[PDB]
Subunit: 336 residues, 3 copies
């Protein structure tokens, strides 16, 4: 398309919502290609990640960890206005794995505190993709400080299974998984700092052990449980987008399955089916489609169970509806 042709395309301003919820959108494209506009303000802020009051100096796109899910359709253009407030202390940028050129846009979006930039790229490939900050020389530090999220580029005709039958979800949730490397003092106690820069040296030493101190969903232990549990009802079709910008993960819905799973996160690659536990490599996003069949509480976890239950990578789904005794039944309840 020419610059003129692009300039004539309809524009649509999208309002982002905080994970795990996703902004309003239509699975099947409404009309031809458009320039979908988004704006995100970068916020360097302290976040508490566990019940011991452990702090991380988060570098959050739109104020959240992970950054919000942006949804467009194949061949639409995504135009992001990215803002770095003067209240911040570091330079930041953004690299869209969904984009083509200049390090995913990282090379064209380096903004110091007080600056903003506007990047536009054509979403030529359908699927879920990670996006993350990548400042030359300080790439992993920003990413493991929570500066990453994902976007979903839906096929214009919506989702389909391997044989072309449409797959239409009732609900969609975005789970961003984050590995954190929090420094500890001589007494095994997590350290606190009053400036992001202050923790850099100590954090790099922990990062080099390749052993995170915490692995969490939506920025903190228990973030997606209890009251923030995701919800659904028997019969509902749910798409769960999951990303990990720096380290491998292996999602599993305890009590359910991934009926269709685009493990590589790319829609032109046929989905795997009937999955118990799928795999998403560090630096990628994946997506699982499941139709709930039983009511109750489900644990959605990274299935290295130490990472899920000792380090924090566990979320819950609360499902309403009628119990199905054909699928499962307690013939004899626990007894002497």
């Amino acid at each position: 398309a020419t610059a003129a042709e692009i300039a004539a395309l309809p524009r649509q301003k999208v309002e982002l919502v905080d994970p795990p919820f996703v902004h309003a959108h239509s699975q099947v494209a409404e009309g031809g290609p458009k320039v979908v506009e988004f704006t995100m303000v970068i916020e360097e802020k302290k976040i508490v990640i566990d019940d011991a009051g452990t702090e991380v100096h988060a570098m959050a796109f739109n104020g959240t960890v992970p950054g919000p899910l942006m949804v467009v359709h194949q061949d639409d253009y995504l135009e992001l206005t990215l803002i770095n407030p003067e209240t911040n202390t570091l330079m930041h940028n953004i690299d869209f794995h969904a984009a083509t050129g200049a390090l995913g846009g990282g090379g064209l979006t380096e903004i110091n505190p007080g600056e903003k930039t506007i990047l536009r790229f054509k979403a030529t490939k359908p699927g879920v993709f990670v996006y993350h900050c990548a400042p030359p020389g300080m790439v992993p530090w920003h990413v493991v400080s929570g500066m990453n999220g994902a976007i979903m580029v839906l096929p214009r005709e919506g989702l389909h299974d391997g044989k072309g039958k449409a797959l239409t979800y009732d609900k969609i949730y975005y789970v961003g998984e984050q590995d954190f490397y929090v420094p500890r003092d001589e007494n095994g106690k997590y350290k606190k700092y009053e400036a992001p820069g202050d923790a850099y040296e100590d954090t790099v030493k922990v990062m080099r052990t390749l052993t995170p101190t915490h692995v969490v969903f939506n920025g903190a232990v228990g973030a997606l449980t209890g009251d923030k549990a995701m919800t659904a009802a028997v019969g509902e079709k749910v798409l769960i987008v999951h990303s990990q910008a720096n380290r491998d993960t292996r999602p599993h819905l305890m009590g359910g399955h991934g009926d269709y799973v685009w493990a590589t996160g790319k829609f032109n690659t046929p989905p795997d089916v009937d999955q118990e536990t799928w795999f998403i490599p560090g630096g990628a996003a994946g997506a699982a489609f499941y139709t709930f069949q039983q009511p109750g509480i489900y644990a959605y976890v990274n299935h290295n169970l130490i990472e899920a239950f000792e380090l924090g990578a566990a979320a819950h789904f609360k499902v309403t509806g009628e119990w199905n005794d054909d699928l499962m039944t307690s013939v004899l309840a626990p007894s002497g």
Copy 2:
């Protein structure tokens, strides 16, 4: 199916056998859906996992690590009588990744020492699946103490490749891989404990390093070698089911390949072919089909060679038959 219809189905009691062997079964289902009955007693027992005499307080389904492979066909019902003897000290349960609802059955099978329970579920999806204990709040500890195994839900018409051609194995083995985290003393020597509870705190500390001290097949270093090496013959078709309930693995048959590999372990997902090394994420089971073409010894290993040869993840196959010089030949034996 209604309660009445399920009650009318035929029932077959199966006698389990210890890994790596698999109880008798038919690849192609004989007759219509059945309620297949299994019984397993849980044994908390001390086991030795290496030649030095290192001990682990195992939590073992049917007394073995891994628990035995249960085999059924799609749409059969699996009815498990699970017994927790009064001689044990902890509450246990079971989560079948093959099942739908109540955390894989975990929420309906919590039994204290002195109790039993009977759970029935419909095996609606074909493939190999992990099953493991999962007591709320103590999940990884039970699993990495060896309380896990797998089941195989065969398609009613047996296995087929991705294009529909039947794949019939001559024999099958089940290799359960287990990551152990054994505490060490100040001399770097593994510690022993009177009771399993005494080891909890020290073990959790090791677990948090995400670095196992041992990674073994069938419960111990070298368990599948020597007189217990697996066997085959040139021309023989072997299915190798492999599971890891907590940590990733990358099986490799040194000197051979994975002709057909359902790396995700799900039979409705076409198998990869001509594999050198496949990948099974923690929390899943996979299966590889191979027709041996050369006689001799083969090493079957987790291909992180440090894990295979330093930590214990290596098994052997002894293969009988005639050498094929077309496939391979020593043109010049080692010489000056």
Copy 3:
């Protein structure tokens, strides 16, 4: 086929070239099956792997880490003359994952210093495959000392996509990734040793932590960056073969994608498409095909960003050509 037939096949000697480059070959086979002859001399030598003068006693096939890529076509025979000079101190051999029998040829090629051997095997399966030294009892030590490479067995009719359309590359690169485990003294300084054997004990201790001190491409930090960046032009089709003989990796082309990726490395397994980050398990090779669309510098990395930017797994591609503003454009450059 018949004994006479194999004897009558043409023999062709090929001259190897050092990675990341690849010796001359044709994508579509030229003529019928041939016995392709290669010769490699093993070199035990000290190499420097980082900017701090860190040393490793490398065990290098053909004097390079990784060993060179050998290219043949399906059903050709690969006949390797492997030489171990009297100047070396250890016994070595070679295991081709592409081969069938005798531990990939390892059982037939054990050569002490001062000896040579000639192995021939039929390349019956198409794909890229790892080859590595594997002396019984010291397999990981040789492999993590850099004694590994890969071969590519192209289909006789060249590469094709999942729909049968031909995929012809303009150039090919071979990126071998190596995890090193270098001992450090109590001050944190990397240790140096007089002979390879002297470092054995200290090295195995580091290996058991499953945490490499360095993860590099082409044998050293920055080996494929700056003046040694790989190159391409907009519109050019490039195949990137990647291997890791001992540990998992997750390649990503920053600013690009893997248009077609044989993640398992086997050509009879349809390639995944539009990949952002792919996954190659330890003990395997994979291949990605990409058509460059934008000029500039690209970072090709292992996407656990700590491994890429702190440990060394980052390479660069320098691409020439015209910028495509349709694909990506800076609507507003960084500004207050």
